Scaffold this active site. Structure first.
Site, PDB file in Angstrom:
ATOM      1  N   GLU A  15      -1.845  18.519  13.666  1.00 23.09           N
ATOM      2  CA  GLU A  15      -2.831  18.473  14.741  1.00 23.09           C
ATOM      3  C   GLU A  15      -3.460  19.833  15.033  1.00 23.09           C
ATOM      4  O   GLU A  15      -4.654  19.909  15.344  1.00 23.09           O
ATOM      5  CB  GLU A  15      -2.182  17.912  16.006  1.00 23.09           C
ATOM      6  CG  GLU A  15      -1.681  16.481  15.867  1.00 23.09           C
ATOM      7  CD  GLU A  15      -2.710  15.553  15.247  1.00 23.09           C
ATOM      8  OE1 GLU A  15      -2.329  14.743  14.374  1.00 23.09           O
ATOM      9  OE2 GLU A  15      -3.894  15.625  15.633  1.00 23.09           O
ATOM     10  N   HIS A  72      -8.477  -1.742   7.339  1.00 19.52           N
ATOM     11  CA  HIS A  72      -9.720  -1.072   6.948  1.00 19.52           C
ATOM     12  C   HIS A  72     -10.858  -2.052   6.694  1.00 19.52           C
ATOM     13  O   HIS A  72     -12.030  -1.688   6.841  1.00 19.52           O
ATOM     14  CB  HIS A  72      -9.500  -0.187   5.723  1.00 19.52           C
ATOM     15  CG  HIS A  72      -8.584   0.968   5.973  1.00 19.52           C
ATOM     16  ND1 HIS A  72      -7.215   0.832   6.055  1.00 19.52           N
ATOM     17  CD2 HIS A  72      -8.845   2.279   6.181  1.00 19.52           C
ATOM     18  CE1 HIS A  72      -6.671   2.013   6.286  1.00 19.52           C
ATOM     19  NE2 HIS A  72      -7.638   2.909   6.367  1.00 19.52           N
ATOM     20  N   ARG A  89       0.817  -1.203   0.000  1.00 22.85           N
ATOM     21  CA  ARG A  89       0.000   0.000   0.000  1.00 22.85           C
ATOM     22  C   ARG A  89       0.855   1.258   0.000  1.00 22.85           C
ATOM     23  O   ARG A  89       0.385   2.310  -0.435  1.00 22.85           O
ATOM     24  CB  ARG A  89      -0.964  -0.031   1.193  1.00 22.85           C
ATOM     25  CG  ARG A  89      -1.803   1.220   1.409  1.00 22.85           C
ATOM     26  CD  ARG A  89      -2.961   0.917   2.361  1.00 22.85           C
ATOM     27  NE  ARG A  89      -3.135   1.889   3.437  1.00 22.85           N
ATOM     28  CZ  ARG A  89      -3.481   3.163   3.274  1.00 22.85           C
ATOM     29  NH1 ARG A  89      -3.654   3.664   2.059  1.00 22.85           N
ATOM     30  NH2 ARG A  89      -3.747   3.913   4.332  1.00 22.85           N
TER      31      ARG A  89
END
Ligand SMILES: [Zn+2]
Lengths: 198, 588, 50
Positions: free
Chosen positions: B350, B480, B248
């Protein structure tokens, strides 16, 4: 002055009179209204304004004469877990009148559902507690509010001043203003004795 | 009176309760996050369980409110969220069974062993580094052959009960269940029904594809230095070789595939370590950056209430870059931050989530969320990408005037990004489309792996180095699937990031390829973004994307204008071998 | 007399120092002359002869 100069309030407003022009005035009476709200609510309280405070808890006249104070009281009435001993009305069937107060807890209703003595679907207790915690943001922190209302009436004044006294001087020709008596001249000590009320 | 009055008063009685009870849960969870120990567990649990039981009760009460009479929309949108039954629409026995299937297959993925090695670090750190066909093939095969063994039998039973809740929640499939969040409904022009998310995503995937076909062909031609005996110049790439155990990411291949590797990438961590910035300085620089963007300052309680540095062994706490919003104005960060430029940019990452969670806080509780599941993540990265550029790092001063940027440096830069990003959009659309086929049922439970290794060649250009069957599943062998996640977020995040980038850079009057765009001191670019953060889910993302980019539908050309010189040199270098790949080869 | 000065007015003991801060105000205001407004708020041209 000791209030005006205190430099310890996060807001100070006055209405009908400018705040600097207050010791040079007298009134029939004054009344002081005081309560606790969130900082996020502090912005709701002015003549003309609207909000859960102005609608359901405390309301000003749009021709208010007087002054308003607030400061953050977090450091003496917030607590861990939260302070829930302070309550506000969330709902009322009609908005308040200026200076109205009503503690009544009768159940509020929305839509056609006669509440018949219990809360439920669209039948609610009209009051909520804050839950002031020290972790809260300042909008969610508590503030102590005071409102001063100034009375003028056909009756005589009772609150005033204070007036300022000044140093005495003698033998010179001077202008003098004794207890509201006015004149000019020379002052000297005297032998005659009055009665104690003259 | 009206139902709208009736609904208003109910939702007001919700909102004031929901923001308090959610806070109580969230504070206990922060304390557990701050102190990963018992009693903190129980306090976190009890408050979160009772919050859920409150939220389920309110949802059950919300059923008696006839949605169609509300015209306010905003009341309607809160009802349309709250009234969603979810799993509770199932029969309790099926709810309990699927709950067991979820818990078990999640635990297997959390615990599976390859013999022995755990998934983390054992297999990951092998496949990032092994470069041995024998170890890599074993480490790839055994993950399917020892843990895929266990996930596949459960996945087969998970799909049906998920489809049953989708049907009973009036979705067309359990892919449509995830597609539901991208739906815009009841609006002139802005409407975007659930199925419209299959369109445009496939239309843009077919459009990004050439850049990845030239990357794959370059990587293949370059990596045949590492795998000469194991890679065909014409075939797909063998799924075990490609720097990851799933493949991936090719980001680990970067160190082997740099074309201009004699030109190191830009960094200034050495100057920050030299000047001994103490992480708190880094968050201070992050504030000054946001202030340079025109975003507001940190709140006073944040600085002490957050955790901005590693607590050490004296306070047991798992820690990773984590924007924290608790409500009641309680914002915090948790990170064991250290002295690097990547801690710096993850602090910005963040802090973008901190800003988004702050801006729509003016909305009511349910609307205090992003306008879609991918917009929140795109906003997170775009304040990182904007600060990452060497121009900003020169404005930071830590970048010396020595060794300014040049094409040879920036091709090295963009390459690793491409191996991180445009290598993953094929895999992202692959699994999400294959999941659309599983949940629709285009392929029965025995075809799943056979359709997979067909589409892996069409989509990703990757092939099974040794074949696997109904005893195996490469999809269910990944988070996932095994953790029931909407994955399309990664695809949409990427395009929104560069779509917003182009809009912000156009406001910044950027020049040339978007790699040297800087948004600091261009306050208008920040305010133009902030006015979208202010809305969140209260307004359609098909409107907020018009507000930022003007694109009323998804566009991928901004990404091609970011990778623009990388795509130029891929095309130029690709003629080192065959261009693109062919489906008709695998090593065996 | 006419006075076209634009210096800051100070409403209280807090010295403004030109800062236009707390109790510090600009001494001019502009009229709300929209044509859809009440006649007391509508503009009137005035001329004086001496
Ligand atoms: Zn993110």
């Amino acid at each position: 002055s000791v209030l005006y100069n205190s430099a310890s309030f996060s807001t100070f407003k006055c209405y009908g009179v400018s705040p600097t022009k207050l010791n040079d005035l007298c009134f029939t009476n004054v009344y002081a209204d005081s309560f606790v709200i969130r900082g996020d609510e502090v912005r709701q309280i002015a003549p003309g304004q609207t909000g859960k405070i102005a609608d359901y808890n405390y309301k000003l006249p749009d021709d208010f004469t007087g002054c308003v104070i607030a400061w953050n009281s977090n450091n003496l009435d917030s607590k861990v877990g939260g302070n829930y001993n302070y309550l506000y009305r969330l709902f009322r069937k009609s908005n308040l009148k200026p200076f109205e107060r009503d503690i009544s807890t009768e159940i509020y209703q929305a839509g056609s559902t006669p509440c018949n003595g219990v809360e439920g679907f669209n039948c609610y207790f009209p009051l909520q507690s804050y839950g002031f915690q020290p972790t809260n943001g300042v909008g969610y922190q508590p503030y102590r509010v005071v409102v001063l209302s100034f009375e003028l009436l056909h009756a005589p004044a009772t609150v005033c001043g204070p007036k300022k006294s000044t140093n005495l001087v003698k033998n010179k020709c001077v202008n003098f203003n004794f207890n509201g008596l006015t004149g000019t001249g020379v002052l000297t000590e005297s032998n005659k004795k009055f009665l104690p009320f003259q | 009176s009206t139902i709208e009055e009736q609904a208003k008063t109910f939702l007001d009685k919700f909102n004031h309760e929901a923001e308090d009870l959610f806070y109580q849960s969230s504070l206990a969870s922060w304390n557990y996050n701050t102190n990963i120990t018992e009693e903190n567990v129980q306090n976190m649990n009890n408050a979160g369980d009772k919050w859920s039981a409150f939220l389920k009760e309110q949802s059950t009460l919300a059923q008696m409110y006839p949605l169609q009479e509300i015209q306010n929309l905003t009341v309607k949108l809160q009802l349309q969220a709250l009234q969603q039954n979810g799993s509770s629409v199932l029969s309790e026995d099926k709810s309990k069974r699927l709950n067991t299937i979820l818990n078990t297959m999640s635990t297997i993925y959390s615990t599976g062993k390859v013999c022995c090695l755990l998934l983390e670090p054992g297999l990951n750190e092998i496949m990032a580094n092994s470069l041995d066909y024998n170890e890599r093939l074993w480490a790839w095969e055994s993950w399917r052959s020892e843990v895929g063994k266990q996930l596949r039998p459960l996945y087969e039973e998970y799909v049906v009960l998920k489809n049953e809740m989708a049907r009973a929640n009036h979705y067309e499939d359990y892919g449509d269940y995830w597609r539901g969040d991208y739906e815009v409904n009841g609006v002139d022009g802005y409407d975007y029904s659930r199925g419209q998310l299959i369109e445009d995503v496939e239309h843009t995937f077919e459009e990004i594809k050439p850049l990845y076909e030239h990357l794959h062909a370059y990587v293949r031609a370059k990596l045949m230095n590492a795998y000469p005996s194991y890679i065909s110049p014409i075939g797909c790439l063998p799924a075990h070789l490609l720097g990851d155990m799933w493949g991936r990411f090719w980001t680990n291949l970067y160190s082997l595939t740099v074309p201009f590797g004699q030109k190191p990438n830009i960094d200034v961590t050495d100057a920050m370590v030299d000047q001994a910035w103490d992480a708190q300085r880094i968050f201070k620089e992050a504030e000054k950056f946001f202030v340079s963007v025109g975003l507001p300052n940190m709140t006073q309680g944040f600085w002490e209430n957050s955790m901005l540095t590693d607590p050490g062994n004296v306070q047991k706490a798992v820690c990773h870059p984590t924007a924290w919003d608790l409500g009641k104005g309680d914002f915090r960060i948790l990170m064991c931050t250290k002295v690097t430029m990547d801690d710096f940019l993850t602090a910005h990452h963040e802090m973008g989530h901190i800003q988004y969670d702050m801006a729509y806080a003016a909305q009511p509780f349910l609307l205090r969320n992003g306008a879609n599941e991918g917009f929140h993540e795109a906003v997170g990265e775009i304040m990182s990408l904007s600060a990452a550029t060497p121009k900003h790092l020169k404005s930071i001063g830590l970048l010396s005037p020595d060794f300014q940027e040049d094409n040879e440096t920036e091709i090295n830069f963009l390459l690793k990004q491409a191996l991180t990003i445009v290598g993953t959009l094929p895999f992202t659309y692959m699994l999400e489309k294959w999941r659309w086929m599983v949940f629709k049922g285009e392929i029965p439970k025995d075809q799943w792996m056979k359709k997979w290794w067909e589409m892996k060649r069409e989509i990703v250009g990757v092939v099974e180095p040794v074949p696997h069957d109904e005893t195996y599943c490469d999809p269910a062998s990944l988070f996932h699937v095994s953790n029931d996640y909407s994955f399309i977020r990664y695809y949409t995040r990427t395009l929104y990031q560069f779509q917003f980038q182009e809009a912000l850079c156009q406001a910044a009057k950027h020049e040339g390829p978007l790699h040297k765009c800087d948004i600091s001191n261009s306050t208008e670019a920040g305010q133009k973004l902030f006015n979208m953060l202010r809305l969140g889910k209260s307004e359609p993302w098909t409107l907020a994307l018009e507000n930022v980019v003007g694109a009323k539908n998804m566009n991928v050309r901004p990404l091609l204008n970011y990778f623009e010189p990388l795509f130029t040199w891929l095309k130029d270098q690709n003629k080192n071998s065959f261009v693109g790949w062919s489906t008709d080869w695998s090593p065996y």
